[PDB]
Write a protein that binds this ligand. Structure first.
Ligand SMILES: COc1ccc([C@@H](Cc2nnn[nH]2)NC(=O)c2ncnc3[nH]ccc23)cc1
Length: 166
């Protein structure tokens, strides 16, 4: 968990303009969060990038988890191997608001972060899931009580977040 170049927004929320895959390779955190869907199919976005960095080992493990346990619920999570990126990967499902899943479930999604003392994570329900990313950071700040290090890929979004926050 040797994080560098973060800006402290609150007592427990830190932010950096970084690619989460590169941060995971430098820091080797105990937990990296994946922005997953309920069937753990890592087709694009953060999930596709983390899976590609494991050379599809995350997808093969995820398929075995789904065959044995069934899909996750929206707002839910599971802990699987972090492979070469982290000790563990916490796969978290935020609501896809573009598909009618309630925005209220973004709070439930961030509550899964509280099981882990320190996490490297992306913003949840952003990208194709359609939530406003600044709203997602607000929910993160209001819900997560453990130490979260957020990696925001787009510099334009990073600047809007830092301006809206501290
Ligand atoms: C479907 O859920 C999503 C959640 C978040 C996301 C977005 C939110 C975002 N948009 N501009 N910066 N951040 N984040 C990433 O895609 C992302 N973030 C950090 N490192 C990365 N490496 C490769 C991809 C990537 C998309 C989709």
């Amino acid at each position: 968990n040797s994080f560098s170049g973060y800006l402290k927004l609150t007592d427990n929320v830190y932010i950096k303009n970084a690619d989460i895959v590169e941060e995971a390779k430098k820091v080797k955190p105990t937990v990296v969060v994946n922005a997953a869907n309920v069937y753990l199919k890592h087709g694009g976005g953060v999930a596709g990038a983390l899976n590609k960095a494991t050379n599809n080992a995350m997808q093969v493990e995820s398929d075995d988890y789904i065959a044995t346990n069934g899909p996750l619920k929206v707002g839910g999570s599971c802990v699987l191997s972090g492979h070469n990126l982290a000790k563990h990967c916490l796969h978290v499902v935020g609501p896809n608001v573009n598909k009618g899943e309630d925005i209220q479930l973004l709070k439930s999604a961030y509550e899964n972060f509280n099981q882990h003392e320190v996490l490297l994570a992306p913003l949840l329900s952003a990208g194709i899931f359609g939530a406003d990313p600044i709203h997602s950071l607000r929910v993160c700040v209001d819900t997560v009580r453990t130490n979260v290090y957020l990696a925001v890929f787009d510099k334009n979004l990073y600047d809007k977040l830092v301006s809206s926050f501290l």
